[PDB]
């Protein structure tokens, strides 16, 4: 990334007139913050440190993910930006992992400092007869499009670090320790350390004295044509066993297998794997009932995916997600809504509660109740029949204890949508096309039903 | 611990207790009722006593002064009548998948326990001396598999339909 | 409106200490002749009933009864600001969403004021007290507390048996059995230590020890405790106040019923 | 890493020279065979054999120490005919007091670490060893279950 | 509506006269009454008959009931919240409202509760875990003079044998299409519906498969579409999930591939996320797949075998989609 | 039979407080010359041994010794009913399944009576006390408690070292080290505060602080504590009673 490293150095040299009073209203860069983004382990932090030191700045690093007290940190950042350090050298602030700050405190403080400096500069330019930012700020993220950074981006100079720099650093350490290491062995050490700089330096020191579950899932669908299938199988078995998280690996395999290319005859391969997956579910249920002796067999089920679906065609890494946690939380929320409706029926309908099972309520009663509420009353020309149906629907809303709430969360005084509480809609409406049609019809019906409920009150 | 195995209480070793319970409660029944009750109990004196109490209540409510019949006992015990079982045998012997499926859907409307239907079919098929031994091995294994699947909380309709279809292909 | 000023915040704090733990919701009602309050536990085996007459207050004004329900825990959380010697005034309008507790020291100095959120409870005060009970007895409340604290260790059930001139508390459980037998007696050297007993019919009832333990708290409000038992109704344990009383009605165990 | 045969043999020879023990080549070979690269276990077995019989001979070592449990299990699983495997399971394992849980678990380990047969047949044998296990853990652990497991493994190996 | 017209006594029942007479016989002497287990198809009217039997054992105040709440503490600080349907003569518990914590609620509540006795109605006894049933096994026998159980279930298959023996078993066969038609006739004459021809009511029965709860609800749903006047060719109102399952079977018989298996898994996820049990999904899917006339007996036999196998798998597993997708893939491989 | 009446239930309650926590089972035996009791902890490093002579009671009758074992926890649970001033009578027949504790107030008024279930324990009283110990010392028990409470914070081991005219307690652990040095002295202004020491041989033993902490409880029974140490046997810490004593024998570390 030499071009990127020269751009960073060029941006830090634009601070030189303001900080060092050297000749290349304060001639500062238009963008006062440098924002570095890119993959982990490529040296973002190391490049920020080296270029800041090379430019004559003292480097102060803050991890933004660990500092869960922006309002307090505030004092640290204000001292580091505006107070003279005892060091002869001006401070450069390096903020690492700024995308990890779940609490916008750190970013709000930086935005407040930038806005205060813009107000102070405009007063110096236009003010007829306020702490100015005299120090550079470097911020490092993994993700540029993180919601927290949206307010900071306009003040930032954005620099992408793409995927050598570790090899150059390790060579410089070898040369300073008088170690004659062949460049091949340093590459093999980098590959062993997976780009961990700390692990690399420790392994080098030891020489001188003398698998993410996702990566395993993608490896389970890959066959190398140049290695024995048995050696690959034992290597994968050892990696699955060392990880101890066989369940997450299998859930990964389950989400990936439909998208994987596998020579297909009749999609039987999937039928054989449903029986294993069922075997895993029985084994996982038995782990809570019996002392975990059965845990040794849990590593075998992921390896059936390597045997059945492993192909040379699968060269690209498929990214994955956790639909199950979202489905479990949604199933919990829907079960809680249904449990609340069942309690409401028990309090009002003395007999209905005896005939209503949870399943019959979800599949039979609630879909019909919603179809009755969503029915187009605008097609009914007979006012008497419209009034009678509306009186029966008000009686049904009362039997199920369904409250019409005016959600006034619109915010702009136009059409506060009426919503049913509890929201039966989230339990019954499975089809996204039907959701939009039903919402438009319901809005006119619910206003008529609310007016009738108010008339009855 | 010393292992004490309690034996199933069939008609032979429990007819005395059942007759004592019937006499102590003035349960006026026919000749082959009590022995039949335990036959439905399949080695369970508690279920037999419960069935006897139910039959006595049903006979005291009527007040006709007659004796309890084996048919009245097997009616409230969940036993499928003989004619309904013979209809199932006819549908299994002669009939295709569609007719068997329709008759099973109709039979599941009338509430019967699938375990009792499987037991009655097993008794009929193993007891009848009109089927080949090769057919008998297969019917025994199929009934065993169906009972083992039903003993796990499965859907009675699907298991019964699968059993009848598998034994119809024989 | 509600306007009741207690001379010492301490009295109210001890009263609430009595409802504490054993009940969650309390329904108060102030009126022309004073304040009453009722609370029933979830299992419905214990009813805590309070009555404070107008004379128990330093100042009381009521031209319009007000009923208000609240969470007991929230109330006690706030009930440790009385300094005991502080003055406490309970205040509420005729249609309240809150109850105001106002603690003030003699001098204008420090004024602690709270605004407690109320709960809506269907007004349904019970009137389960009997005309006559099978047996009636009173004894020092500290003595009753000890009796309960002794036996409690042995079982979850403590039986009270009454026969002519004899009161016997019994517990029997795993580690063994215990009993405390007391006899009626008049002590002129100070009659607040006497043990009275009026028996119209021998009684023998069992109560859940966990509940009797909740009830003994009333010792802090009165020197003596009155216990009224009947085979027809919940037992009544009563702690008299100056103009008022705190009552605990406890349903006997059927065989298993607290 | 594991200690090769030469290193453990040299250490045992040094210990014998330092202790003046009567030994023989086959006895030391059996000791090293039962040690499986475990120097501590090797020295412990040597001392136990010395204090129990005095002479370090293969007969004494085998009568006091147990032939590596996994090797008999491997020979049982690698049997070509069903009757040979059944006789091995009966005489070597079942008639000597080895519990069914140890047999099935040792069986799983042997298979997982097997290299004579292919991957798919190994996975099928592991599946059979594990379905049985699911029955062994439920309290149905008997000789019939292990016999059925061996029969299913042979049926899988029966093409 | 189903609730507006429901029998409240034994003399108000209008089908299964032999069952009504058996219930009257069983309620003639109410104190020497053993525990009862009502089993049969879902929607037959067993929950109404149990309440009608209680109305014969006790006064008419059995229907005046109230809903309360009770809290429980498990081995950890997770608080179990359970609502209870209580009456001055009986109480109703539904252990199907929680996970594996049925045993705690069952044992504690029944021990606290334990004419002269108080009836207990266990709703949906099929969801009772085996440990909860084992705990109830001895509670049914130790307290037999104060607590009598009336367990309502749809199939005795998951009920253990000890519980089956510890209570009388009462079967409730689904009412005939004629009785359903007669009930719908009284309903439409009381609700003032207009029928051009009576036979439509029969068709309603033929669309309900003995279910009265579904029959009346569908009749009322189609009465709102025809504006309180049913014609000779009024369409049959089918639930949304049934239409989704039918479209799923059409997709199955039309395309058999992995790309279609992905959208099948998506449809299964959308069905499971909206409070639809997987056993009913599998049952309806298999039954409507057997109705496909394009397949032959060889395909239907394999389909029913795979459905039984995967039903056993689902009854032995917890991740329901893991078995549903496997069954769908096996059916795709069969066709 | 067992029939022992304590003037004040308090004495028995404090005695049991001494067995409390550090032992689970206690074996009592009443006889013609009084009552004895022994309890050994699970690890067998501590023995608690009691002796109460006939004169410590207000009334004692024994025509037939009775041995009875019981759970200490159960006993203490019941041992808070004495009002301290209540009278306590221990009662048991010759072949008991229970032990009766009877608390009564002066007047007939209130009578709390308990029937405690007994445990069967193989009678095997130990007699490990020595004729002569290397060194013997006594000092106020409150002082000994403070010494133990100080050092305990520093380590799980407290060493006691004795040399001519010098007693030194030492603890050394993570945060640092501590020591308490005391010297023999006779205070005539009140000799219950004196510190005596008779050394026949210098001693240096280490004890587990958790155990010394259990032992200090005896302060509530006596003003002074006697400590006898030997390199040949468990150390003896003794708390005298009026006609009796409570003894704790503690095995040194390695
Ligand atoms: N005796 C009866 N006569 C007429 N309709 C009845 C009778 N018993 C029940 N029903 C109705 O038939 C339907 C049966 O469904 P449901 O009540 O849910 O069954 P269950 O009582 O088994 O839960 C309901 O509409 C119910 O009110």
Q: Is E103 annotated as a binding residue?
A: no
Q: Tell the residue nearest (CA) to atom 9 of ligand 1.
A: E45
Cα(F228)–Cα(F235) distance, integer angstroms: 6
Alpha-carbon distance F24 to nearest alpha carbon in chain C (angstroms): 15
> Chain A to chain D, count of Cβ pairs less than 8 Å apart?
40
In a mutagenesis test of the A interface, which of D122, D129, D130, D141 is the best target, namely the one with the most A β-carbons within 10 Å? Answer: D130
Cα(E315)–Cα(A360) distance, integer angstroms: 19
Residue closest to B157 by CA, chosen among B123, B107, B89: B107
F and E adjacent (3 or more CB pairs under 8 angstroms): no
Q: Quick one: tokens of F19?
A: 């067995």
**Distant-in-sequence, close-in-space partners of E44: CB < 8 Å, separation ≥ 6:** B111, E172, E173, E174, E175, E210, E211, E212
Cα(A287)–Cα(C89) distance, integer angstroms: 61
**Distant-in-sequence, close-in-space partners of D139: CB < 8 Å, separation ≥ 6:** none
Using CA atoms, how far residue A293 sits from A247, C237, D100, D105, in Å, is 16, 58, 14, 9
Using CA atoms, how far residue D80 sits from B97, C166, D75, E102, in Å, is 45, 89, 10, 51
Cα(D37)–Cα(D39) distance, integer angstroms: 6
Neighbours of A12 (CB within 10 A): 22
Q: Quick one: tokens of A182?
A: 């062949």
Collapse the DSSP code of E103 into the 3-class scheme (helix H, G, I; strand E, B; otherwise coil) and give the result: helix
Ligand 1 atom showing the smallest separation from residue E47 Cα: 21
Q: Phi, psi at residue A279, to the nearest 5°?
A: -60, -45
Q: What is the side-by-side order of every strand in the sheet holding F203-208?
A: F177-182, F166-172, F157-163, F203-208
Say if CB B57 and CB E26 are below 8 A apart.
Answer: yes
The count of C-alpha atoms lying within 13 angstroms of the C-alpha of F186, restricted to the half-sphere facing its C-beta, is 1
Q: Give the containing element (helix H, strand E) for A338.
A: helix A323-347
Handedness of CA A232, A235, A237, A239 (dihedral sign): negative
Alpha-carbon distance B22 to nearest alpha carbon in chain E (angstroms): 16
- Kindly provide the residue ranges of all beta strands, DSSP E only, lying in D1-149, ordered along the sequence: 22-23, 55-56
Q: Given CB atoms, is A328 within the 8 Å cutoff of chain E?
A: no
User: Is A430 in contact with E240 (Cβ distance < 8 A)?
Assistant: yes
Give the burial class of D91: count Cβ atoms within 10 A of its Cβ; 0-12 exposed, 13-18 middle, 19 or more buried. exposed
Cα(C91)–Cα(C2) distance, integer angstroms: 5
Cα(E322)–Cα(A275) distance, integer angstroms: 9
Cα(C251)–Cα(C205) distance, integer angstroms: 10
Collapse the DSSP code of E117 into the 3-class scheme (helix H, G, I; strand E, B; otherwise coil) and give the result: coil
Q: Give the containing element (helix H, strand E) for D100.
A: helix D100-112
Residue closest to A309 by CA, chosen among A272, A261, A274: A261
Full 3-state SS string of chain F: CEEEEECCHHHHHHHHHHHCCCCCEEEEEEECCEEEEEEECCCCCEEEEEEEEHHHCCEECCCCCEEEEEEHHHHHHHCCCCCCCCEEEEEECCCCCEEEEEEECCCCCCEEEEEEECECCCCCCCCCCCCCCCEEEEEEHHHHHHHHHHHHCCCCEEEEEEECCEEEEEEECCCCEEEEEECCECCCCCHHHCEEEEECCCEEEEEEHHHHHHHHHHHHCCCEEEEEECCCCCEEEEEEECCEEEEEEECCCC
The torsion of the CA quartet C4, C5, C8, C14, rounded to 10 degrees, works out to: 10
Cα(E159)–Cα(E169) distance, integer angstroms: 12
Using CA atoms, how far residue E105 sits from A343, E79, E108, E148, in Å, is 17, 12, 5, 17
Residue whose tokens read 């007000």: C66
Q: Phi, psi at residue F159, to the nearest 5°?
A: -95, 140
**Distant-in-sequence, close-in-space partners of B126: CB < 8 Å, separation ≥ 6:** B136, B139, B140
The count of C-alpha atoms lying within 13 angstroms of the C-alpha of E57, restricted to the half-sphere facing its C-beta, is 27
Collapse the DSSP code of E122 into the 3-class scheme (helix H, G, I; strand E, B; otherwise coil) and give the result: strand
Q: What is the side-by-side order of every strand in the sheet holding C59-60?
A: C59-60, C2-6, C87-92, C98-104, C111-117
Residue closest to F48 by CA, chosen among F75, F15, F79: F15
Residues facing C196 on adjacent strands? C138
Length of chain E: 335
Residues facing A96 on adjacent strands? A63
Domain C1-258 has CATH 3.70.10.10: yes
Q: What is the largest CA-CA distance in chain A?
A: 100
Say if CB E51 and CB E9 are below 8 A apart.
Answer: no
Contacts of E67 in chain C (CB under 8 A): none
What would the CATH number be for the domain defined by E177-230? 1.10.8.60
Nearest to A286 among D118, D131, D134 (CB): D134
Neighbours of A282 (CB within 10 A): 17
Query: Helices A366-373 and E212-225, interaxial angle, to 10°?
Result: 10
Cα(E78)–Cα(D138) distance, integer angstroms: 30
100-139 in chain E: CB under 8 A from chain C: 111-112, 114
Contacts of A283 in chain D (CB under 8 A): 130, 134
**Distant-in-sequence, close-in-space partners of E48: CB < 8 Å, separation ≥ 6:** A351, A354, A355, E6, E7
Say if CB B125 and CB B139 are below 8 A apart.
Answer: yes
Using CA atoms, how far residue A297 sits from A14, D109, E41, F105, F231, in Å, is 62, 10, 41, 70, 57
Gaps in chain E with C–N over 2.5 Å, residue before each: 114
Using CA atoms, how far residue B74 sits from A143, B32, B36, in Å, is 74, 12, 8
Cα(A71)–Cα(E284) distance, integer angstroms: 59
Answer whether E120 contacts ligand 1 (Cβ < 6 A): no
Say if CB F188 and CB F233 are below 8 A apart.
Answer: no
Cα(E97)–Cα(E83) distance, integer angstroms: 9
Answer whether E8 contacts ligand 1 (Cβ < 6 A): no
Q: Phi, psi at residue A29, to the nearest 5°?
A: -60, 145
**Distant-in-sequence, close-in-space partners of C162: CB < 8 Å, separation ≥ 6:** C134, C135, C137, C168, C197, C199, C202, C203, C204, C229
Cα(B94)–Cα(B96) distance, integer angstroms: 7
Using CA atoms, how far residue F250 sits from A47, E180, E296, F129, in Å, is 65, 87, 88, 11
Measure the N-to-C terminal CA separation of chain B; round to a whole number of Å: 48
Residues facing F53 on adjacent strands? F34
Residue whose tokens read 């640290």: A76
Cα(D50)–Cα(D57) distance, integer angstroms: 10
Binding residues of A for ATP: 38-45
**Separation of E47 CA from ligand 1 center, angstroms?**
8
Collapse the DSSP code of C168 into the 3-class scheme (helix H, G, I; strand E, B; otherwise coil) and give the result: strand
Per DSSP, helices labelled H in A93-245 are: 105-126, 165-176, 183-193, 197-209, 213-220, 229-243
Cα(E306)–Cα(E332) distance, integer angstroms: 11
Give the burial class of A37: count Cβ atoms within 10 A of its Cβ; 0-12 exposed, 13-18 middle, 19 or more buried. buried
Q: Quick one: tokens of D134?
A: 């699911």
Q: How was this structure determined?
A: cryo-EM
Full 3-state SS string of B39-100: HHHCCCHHHHHHHHHHHHHHHHHHCCCCCECHHHHHHHCCCCCHHHHHHHHHHHHCCCHHHH
Task: Spell C208-224 as b/e; 16+ CB within 10 A means b.
Answer: bbebbbbbbbbbbbbeb
Residues facing C224 on adjacent strands? C140
Residues facing E91 on adjacent strands? E86, E120
1-40 in chain E: CB under 8 A from chain A: 1-3, 6, 8
CA–centroid distance for E105 within its chain: 22
**The domain at E1-171 falls in which architecture?**
3-Layer(aba) Sandwich (3.40)
Answer whether E46 contacts ligand 1 (Cβ < 6 A): yes
Q: Give the containing element (helix H, strand E) for D31.
A: helix D25-35
User: Is E114 in contact with C43 (Cβ distance < 8 A)?
Assistant: no
Query: Helices E297-316 and A269-289, interaxial angle, to 10°?
Result: 20
Collapse the DSSP code of C128 into the 3-class scheme (helix H, G, I; strand E, B; otherwise coil) and give the result: coil
Nearest to E329 among A267, A350, A360 (CB): A267
Answer whether E210 contacts ligand 1 (Cβ < 6 A): no
Cα(E80)–Cα(D64) distance, integer angstroms: 58
User: Is E301 in contact with B165 (Cβ distance < 8 A)?
Assistant: yes
Mutate to test the pocket of ligand 1, among E3, E4, E6 (most ligand atoms within 8 A of CB): E6
Residues facing F145 on adjacent strands? none
Resolution number, Å:
4.1
Nearest to A339 among E97, E239, E244 (CB): E97
Q: Is E41 annotated as a binding residue?
A: yes
Q: Quick one: tokens of A200?
A: 């690399």
Residue closest to C209 by CA, chosen among C147, C125, C119, C128: C147
Does the N-terminal peptide bond of residue F9 adopt cis geometry, omega within 30 degrees of 0? no
Handedness of CA B37, B39, B44, B45 (dihedral sign): positive
Measure the N-to-C terminal CA separation of chain D; round to a whole number of Å: 38
Residue whose tokens read 């990696």: A239
Collapse the DSSP code of D133 into the 3-class scheme (helix H, G, I; strand E, B; otherwise coil) and give the result: helix
Neighbours of E262 (CB within 10 A): 13
Q: Quick one: tokens of D3?
A: 């200690």
Residue closest to B11 by CA, chosen among B37, B29, B50: B37
Collapse the DSSP code of C254 into the 3-class scheme (helix H, G, I; strand E, B; otherwise coil) and give the result: coil
| One-character DSSP codes across E160-174 | -HHHHHTSEEEE-PP
Residues facing F103 on adjacent strands? F88, F112
Tell me which DSSP letter residue E145 carries: S
Cα(A33)–Cα(A111) distance, integer angstroms: 10
Using CA atoms, how far residue E309 sits from E199, E303, E320, E323, E324, in Å, is 40, 10, 13, 10, 11
CA–centroid distance for C248 within its chain: 5
Cα(F19)–Cα(C105) distance, integer angstroms: 51
What would the CATH number be for the domain defined by E240-335? 1.20.272.10
**Distant-in-sequence, close-in-space partners of A263: CB < 8 Å, separation ≥ 6:** A311
**Separation of E213 CA from ligand 1 center, angstroms?**
6
Answer whether E153 contacts ligand 1 (Cβ < 6 A): no
Collapse the DSSP code of E247 into the 3-class scheme (helix H, G, I; strand E, B; otherwise coil) and give the result: helix
Q: Give the containing element (helix H, strand E) for C112.
A: strand C111-117
Nearest to E322 among A259, A278, A338 (CB): A278
Tell me which DSSP letter residue D90 carries: I
- Compute chain C's Rg from CA coordinates: 19
Residue whose tokens read 């002066």: F106
Collapse the DSSP code of E6 into the 3-class scheme (helix H, G, I; strand E, B; otherwise coil) and give the result: coil
**Distant-in-sequence, close-in-space partners of C16: CB < 8 Å, separation ≥ 6:** C72, C75, C76, C79
Q: Give the containing element (helix H, strand E) for A45.
A: helix A44-54
Cα(F133)–Cα(F114) distance, integer angstroms: 42
Residue closest to A286 by CA, chosen among B151, E127, D133, D146: D133
Contacts of E324 in chain A (CB under 8 A): none
Q: Is A193 left (phi over 0), alpha (psi -120 to 50) or beta?
A: alpha
Q: Quick one: tokens of F115?
A: 């029937």
Q: Quick one: tokens of C202?
A: 């021998």
Q: Give the containing element (helix H, strand E) for E112.
A: helix E102-113
Q: Phi, psi at residue E174, to the nearest 5°?
A: -60, 140
Domain residues of chain E, as ranges?
1-171, 177-230, 240-335
Cα(A274)–Cα(A272) distance, integer angstroms: 6
Cα(B139)–Cα(B126) distance, integer angstroms: 8
Handedness of CA D137, D140, D144, D149 (dihedral sign): negative
Domain F1-254 has CATH 3.70.10.10: yes
Say if CB F247 and CB F49 are below 8 A apart.
Answer: yes
Residue whose tokens read 């507790």: C101
Say if CB C146 and CB C192 are below 8 A apart.
Answer: no
Cα(F177)–Cα(F151) distance, integer angstroms: 8
Residues facing C248 on adjacent strands? C48, C237
D and C adjacent (3 or more CB pairs under 8 angstroms): no
């Amino acid at each position: 990334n030499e071009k990127t490293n020269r751009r960073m150095l060029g941006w830090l040299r634009q601070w030189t007139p303001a900080v060092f009073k050297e000749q290349l209203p304060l001639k500062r860069p238009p963008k006062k913050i440098l924002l570095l983004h890119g993959p982990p382990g490529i040296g973002k932090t190391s490049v920020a440190h080296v270029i800041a030191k090379q430019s004559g700045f003292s480097v102060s690093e803050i991890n933004a993910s660990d500092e869960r007290a922006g309002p307090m940190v505030k004092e640290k950042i204000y001292n580091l930006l505006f107070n003279h350090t005892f060091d002869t050298n001006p401070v450069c602030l390096v903020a690492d992992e700024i995308d990890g700050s779940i609490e916008s405190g750190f970013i709000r403080i930086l935005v407040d400092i930038m806005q205060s400096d813009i107000k102070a500069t405009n007063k110096l330019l236009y003010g007829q007869p306020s702490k100015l930012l005299t120090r550079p700020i470097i911020c490092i993220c993994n993700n540029l499009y993180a919601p927290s950074l949206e307010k900071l981006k306009p003040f930032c100079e954005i620099i992408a670090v793409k995927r050598t720099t570790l090899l150059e650093r390790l060579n410089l350490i070898c040369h300073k320790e008088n170690m004659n290491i062949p460049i091949k062995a340093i590459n093999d050490l980098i590959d062993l350390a997976q780009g961990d700089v700390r692990n690399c330096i420790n392994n080098l020191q030891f020489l001188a004295s003398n698998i993410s579950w996702f990566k395993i899932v993608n490896q389970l669908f890959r066959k190398d044509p140049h290695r024995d299938i048995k050696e690959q199988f034992y290597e994968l078995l050892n990696q699955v066993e060392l990880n101890g998280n066989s369940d997450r690996i299998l859930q990964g395999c389950f989400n990936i297998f439909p998208y994987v290319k596998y020579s297909d005859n009749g999609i039987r391969k999937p039928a054989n794997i449903s029986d294993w997956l069922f075997f895993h579910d029985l084994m996982y249920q038995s782990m809570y009932a019996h002392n975990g002796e059965l845990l040794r067999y849990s590593a075998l089920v992921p390896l059936v995916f390597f045997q059945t679906f492993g192909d040379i065609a699968n060269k690209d890494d498929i990214r994955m997600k956790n639909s199950e946690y979202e489905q479990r939380e949604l199933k919990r929320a829907n079960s809680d809504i249904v449990s609340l409706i069942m309690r409401h029926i028990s309090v009002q309908s003395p007999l209905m509660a005896s005939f209503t099972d949870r399943k019959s309520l979800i599949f039979e009663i609630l879909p019909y109740l919603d179809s009755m509420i969503s029915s187009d009353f605008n097609k009914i020309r007979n006012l008497k029949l419209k009034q009678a149906i509306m009186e029966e629907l008000v009686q049904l809303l009362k039997s199920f204890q369904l409250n019409l709430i005016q959600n006034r969360s619109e915010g702009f005084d136009v059409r506060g949508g009426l919503t049913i509480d509890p929201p039966i809609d989230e339990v019954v409406l499975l089809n996204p096309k039907h959701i939009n049609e039903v919402q438009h019809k319901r809005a006119n019906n619910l206003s008529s039903l609310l007016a009738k409920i108010e008339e009855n009150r | 611990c010393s292992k004490f195995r309690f034996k199933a209480l069939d008609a032979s070793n429990a007819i005395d207790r059942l007759r004592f319970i019937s006499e102590q409660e003035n349960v006026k029944c026919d000749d082959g009722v009590l022995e039949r009750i335990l036959d439905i109990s399949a080695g369970d004196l508690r279920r037999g006593i419960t069935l006897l109490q139910s039959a006595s209540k049903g006979a005291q409510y009527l007040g006709d002064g007659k004796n309890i019949t084996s048919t009245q006992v097997e009616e409230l015990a969940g036993v499928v009548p003989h004619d309904i079982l013979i209809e199932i045998v006819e549908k299994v012997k002669s009939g295709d998948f569609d007719e068997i499926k329709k008759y099973v859907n109709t039979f599941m409307k009338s509430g019967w326990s699938a375990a009792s239907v499987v037991n009655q079919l097993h008794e009929y098929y193993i007891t009848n001396d009109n089927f080949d031994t090769n057919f008998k091995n297969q019917i025994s294994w199929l009934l065993f598999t169906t009972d083992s699947r039903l003993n796990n909380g499965t859907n009675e309709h699907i298991q019964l339909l699968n059993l009848l279809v598998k034994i119809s292909q024989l | 409106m509600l306007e009741a000023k207690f001379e010492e915040a301490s009295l109210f704090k001890r009263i609430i200490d009595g409802f504490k733990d054993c009940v969650q919701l309390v329904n108060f009602q102030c009126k022309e002749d004073g304040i009453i309050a009722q609370a029933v536990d979830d299992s419905r085996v214990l009813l805590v009933s309070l009555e404070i007459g107008v004379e128990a207050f330093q100042e009381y004004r009521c031209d319009h009864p007000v009923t208000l329900g609240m969470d007991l825990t929230s109330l006690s959380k706030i009930l440790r600001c009385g300094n005991n010697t502080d003055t406490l005034t309970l205040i509420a309008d005729n249609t309240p969403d809150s109850i105001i507790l106002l603690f003030e020291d003699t001098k204008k100095d420090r004024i602690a004021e709270y605004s407690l959120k109320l709960m809506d409870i269907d007004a349904d005060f019970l009137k389960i007290e009997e005309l006559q009970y099978d047996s009636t007895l009173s004894l020092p409340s500290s003595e009753f507390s000890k009796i309960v604290r002794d036996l409690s260790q042995l079982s979850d059930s403590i039986n009270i048996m009454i026969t002519k001139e004899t009161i016997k508390f019994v517990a029997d459980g795993d580690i063994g059995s215990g009993s405390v037998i007391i006899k009626p007696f008049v002590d002129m050297e100070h009659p607040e230590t006497s043990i009275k007993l009026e028996m119209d019919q021998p009684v023998d009832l069992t109560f859940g020890a966990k509940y009797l333990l909740d009830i003994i708290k009333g010792s802090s409000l009165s020197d003596r405790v009155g216990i009224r038992l009947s085979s027809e109704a919940p037992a009544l344990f009563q702690f008299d106040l100056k103009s008022g009383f705190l009552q605990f009605f406890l349903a006997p165990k059927f065989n298993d019923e607290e | 890493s594991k200690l090769s045969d030469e290193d453990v043999l040299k250490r045992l020879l040094q210990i014998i020279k330092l202790e003046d023990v009567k030994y023989t080549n086959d006895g030391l070979e059996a000791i090293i065979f039962t040690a499986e690269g475990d120097m501590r276990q090797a020295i412990n077995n040597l001392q136990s054999t010395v204090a129990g019989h005095g002479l370090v001979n293969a007969d004494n070592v085998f009568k006091i120490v147990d032939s590596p449990h996994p090797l008999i299990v491997k020979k049982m699983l690698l049997a070509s005919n069903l009757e040979d495997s059944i006789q091995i399971l009966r005489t070597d394992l079942w008639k000597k007091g080895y519990s069914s849980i140890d047999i099935v678990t040792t069986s799983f380990r042997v298979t997982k670490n097997l290299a004579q047969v292919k991957e798919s047949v190994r996975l099928e044998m592991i599946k059979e060893i594990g379905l049985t296990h699911m029955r062994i853990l439920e309290g149905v652990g008997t000789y019939l279950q292990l016999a059925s497991m061996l029969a299913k493994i042979h049926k899988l190996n029966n093409k | 509506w189903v609730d507006k017209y429901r029998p409240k006594s034994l003399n108000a029942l209008s089908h299964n006269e032999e069952l009504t007479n058996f219930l009257k016989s069983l309620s003639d002497q109410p104190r020497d009454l053993p525990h009862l287990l009502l089993y049969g198809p879902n929607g037959t009217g067993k929950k109404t008959r149990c309440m009608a039997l209680l109305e014969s054992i006790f006064g008419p105040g059995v229907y005046r009931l109230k809903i309360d709440v009770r809290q429980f503490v498990t081995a950890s600080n997770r608080k179990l919240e359970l609502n209870v349907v209580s009456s001055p003569y009986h109480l109703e518990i539904t252990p199907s409202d929680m996970g594996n914590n049925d045993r705690i609620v069952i044992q504690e509540l029944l021990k606290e509760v334990a004419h002269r006795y108080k009836c207990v109605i266990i709703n949906e006894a099929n969801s009772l875990t085996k440990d909860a049933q084992a705990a109830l096994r001895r509670t049914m026998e130790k307290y037999s003079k104060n607590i009598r159980l009336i367990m309502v279930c749809d199939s005795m298959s998951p009920i253990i044998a000890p519980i089956k023996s510890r209570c009388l078993l009462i079967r409730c066969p689904a009412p005939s299409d004629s009785e359903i038609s007669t009930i719908l006739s009284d309903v439409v004459t009381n609700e003032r519906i207009q029928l051009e021809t009576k036979d439509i009511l029969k068709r309603i029965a033929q669309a309900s498969n003995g279910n009265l709860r579904v029959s009346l609800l569908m009749l009322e749903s189609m009465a709102l579409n025809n504006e309180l006047a049913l014609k000779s060719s009024s369409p049959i109102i089918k639930p949304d999930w049934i239409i989704v399952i039918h479209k799923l079977t059409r997709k199955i018989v039309k395309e058999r591939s992995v790309n279609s298996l992905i959208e099948c898994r998506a449809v299964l996820y959308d069905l499971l996320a909206h409070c639809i049990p997987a056993n009913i999904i599998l049952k309806e899917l298999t039954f409507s797949l057997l109705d496909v006339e394009t397949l032959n007996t060889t395909n239907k036999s394999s389909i029913i075998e795979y459905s039984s196998v995967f039903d056993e798998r689902l009854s032995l597993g917890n991740k329901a989609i893991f078995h549903l997708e496997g069954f769908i893939a096996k059916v795709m491989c069969c066709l």
